Amino acid sequence: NDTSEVMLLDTGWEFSQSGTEKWMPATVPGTVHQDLISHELLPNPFYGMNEKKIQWVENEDWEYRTSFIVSEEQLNRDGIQLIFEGLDTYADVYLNGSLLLKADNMFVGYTLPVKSVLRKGENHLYIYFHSPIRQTLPQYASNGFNYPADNDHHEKHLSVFSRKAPYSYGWDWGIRMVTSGVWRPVTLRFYDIATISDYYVRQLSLTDENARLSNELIVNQIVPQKIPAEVRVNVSLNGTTVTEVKQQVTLQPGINHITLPAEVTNPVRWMPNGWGTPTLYDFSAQIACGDRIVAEQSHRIGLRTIRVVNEKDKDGESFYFEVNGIPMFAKGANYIPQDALLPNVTTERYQTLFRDMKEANMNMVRIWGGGTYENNLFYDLADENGILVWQDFMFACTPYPSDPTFLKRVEAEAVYNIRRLRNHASLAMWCGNNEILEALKYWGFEKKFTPEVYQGLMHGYDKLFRELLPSTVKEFDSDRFYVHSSPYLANWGRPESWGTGDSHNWGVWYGKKPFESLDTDLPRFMSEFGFQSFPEMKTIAAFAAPEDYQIESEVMNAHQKSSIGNSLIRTYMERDYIIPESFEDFVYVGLVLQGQGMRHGLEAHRRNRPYCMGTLYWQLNDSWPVVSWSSIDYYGNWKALHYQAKRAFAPVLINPIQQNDSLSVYLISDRLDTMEQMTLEMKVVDFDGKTLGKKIQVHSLEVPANTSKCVYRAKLDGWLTPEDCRRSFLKLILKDKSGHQVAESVHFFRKTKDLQLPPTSVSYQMKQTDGKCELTLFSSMLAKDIFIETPLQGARYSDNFFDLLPGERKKVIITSPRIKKGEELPVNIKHIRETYK
Ligand SMILES: OC[C@@H]1[C@@H](O)[C@H](O)[C@H](O)c2[nH]c(CNc3ccccc3)c[n+]21
Ligand SMILES: [Br-]
Ligand SMILES: [Br-]
Ligand SMILES: [Br-]
Ligand SMILES: [Br-]
Ligand SMILES: [Br-]
């Protein structure tokens, strides 16, 4: 890119428990815990009851060291800069006898001038990590009260004192592994003249005819002389220059601010998943001094507008996203860290997770505030997949300190990550925290703390979430939306508040409300709602024994962290399904349950646009093997919920909704084009495959762009008897003028437990080659909610958790790199009727 040389300090690292004098090889970026595991100095933290057996680690201090060589030629470069993209958390960094840095915030990258401290030959780097617990014990003792952070799984709630990933201290789906280490890369850059400290491509305006941009560079010049330079910006698309601009300057020692306007005529816009291509331009800034390009930085840039509209209206206060001027109904999920040990998350795992969102027709992900500001790769993948990103700051569920030192650390991370992320097309909004305002209003505090301490907490809220964070966003990301808290007003126990802003409706699960309540309890935007399930058996076998297999054994409860657990799964299951006697069948039906109940809500929210303008379910993914609200387990396996979210988020959806012994059929489209001259066709089919009555035809339908509309209503009485309702289903297709199918749905008229399901044999043929299995499935009679189960971790399915309709063949492709020709894939097909006698 330029004349600099970058040395990655990713080898030759060793670590030691402080005070032992024993050193072992370590992997950096990494964690103390992984380094221990890799020498069998911890048990598999995820296996069994082993969580208690790993806790001692957080009490020790840990040292890391490496050495490296610098040449006489490198040492004579104008500048040499050591960069820590991440240190978790309290780290004293020494290089060749110099204390370079006393680090104290996991979420901040540190850039350090080191030329004057480096030596020709061997150079020695030592990092001392103070235990974040022992570091903060004296701070807690001075505080005189315990912050109410119930997800911090320790008697003393020390999490609140440290700018360290909240979930690391435990959460209601997570293991406590309070880890330390060099968690993101370390980089030594040898360079001449200057580095580009920041490059911000600021969009000033965008219309169909012109995008106007301001390229804002901050250049740190490291030599004593004034240096003539030319700044150049090249804008390209797919390798071809679109526009190019330049500016002469003379760079002064220290910081220089440079602004170059650029325009792209007839811009090709970045569109979200579902509405087109997520086009990205390549913007490259260079600093040229004489012949040499001494510094260069590039960003991929998406040209689009995002506006969050949050305005008083007749229904209360709206909360929705307008993308490229068009209201966009949000479809997605809440994202949590993908591992207890962040650096174990590989490039491949990030890529697969985005394939999983894109394939489920999502257009939004919330990076929830108990995790981390995600790495650059996460955002690059969001940009290239058309997925909008809601980014919480990293504060969740408790009030936090607001003393001057604490607020300076926070300001440092807010500036760092805002500048880090603000060039991403995907980045859509910032949210000050998760549930802290709700917590302060509703969760009991005025009777847990003195009135003085409670008042302090309330003024402390404002200092951080209503002043410091919104001011920082206004300064560094001024055209992006900020809201101080999610949910900002609406509270799930208070119906009167549901028309105001975004909701976390935990009436389902925590309030024990039936899934049917999601049809009536409607929000303006659902930013959280959820339901737990045990993960499938091959994941259970990664973490439990057949002994170790009851819903409330020590081990199952050890793998449940919500305030209840596993009893609640059984309670809800009983409402809708016959509860199976075996543990394996109970796991299967609980997957089915979570998928069917949650998709009922996803459909209610889309059906009720424009009152409701988004749904993000809790939660996408898992950080370890566990029972949780996730749609995808720790090993990448889609639960039923993920297949059902795909179906519910389909661009065009036929949604039959039955209430009060009556059926309505809604046609729901997130297409940018209107469909004309459409025909809905339906027919009742019993479980043996025989049609009941005649086909019903609704012709001449239009499905306008971005709308949900009722096209058919019929009372059940006079049409089907209670007996038929238990013994048949409705098949629904939507087709264009010429008979081409654009959508299909199936409807059942009774709860699954009330269906008279025939005993049946799902048979299959298989064609297996390397990487691939093609199965053809057949059953003469209905097989309900079939699960095609294979022991192969992370195998992918074209479909799963679907009703196999009577006498109707169904092709399913299974893929995995570990599918070998001639070593046939174990396949177990389960279905509802098989689970009881
Ligand atoms: O409990 C599941 C999820 C959480 O993991 C996550 O923090 C997410 O923001 C969230 N919000 C709630 C609702 N609020 C509470 C539930 C239980 C105890 C305290 C608060 C539930 N959940
Ligand atoms: Br330097
Ligand atoms: Br520097
Ligand atoms: Br300047
Ligand atoms: Br605010
Ligand atoms: Br009904």
Task: Kindly describe this structure.
Helix 4 runs parallel beside helix 5. The chain has five domains: 1-192, Galactose-binding domain-like (Jelly Rolls); 193-302, Immunoglobulin-like (Sandwich); 303-649, TIM Barrel; 650-751, Immunoglobulins (Immunoglobulin-like, Sandwich), CATH 2.60.40.10; 752-837, Immunoglobulins (Immunoglobulin-like, Sandwich). The protein contains 15 helices and 44 strands. With 837 residues, it is α+β, with helices and mostly antiparallel strands. The longest helix is centred in the middle third of the chain and has 26 residues, at 451-476. Strand 21 and strand 22 (326-328) form a beta hairpin. Helix content is 19%, strand content 34%. The strands form twelve sheets. A six-stranded antiparallel β-sheet has the order 3-2-4-9-6-7. The protein has a six-stranded parallel β-sheet with strand order 27-26-25-24-23-30, covered by helices on one side. Its EC number is 3.2.1.25. Keywords: Glycoprotein, Glycosidase, Hydrolase, Lysosome, Secreted, Signal. GO terms for molecular function: beta-mannosidase activity. Belongs to the glycosyl hydrolase 2 family. Beta-mannosidase B subfamily. It is an enzyme of class 3 (hydrolase).
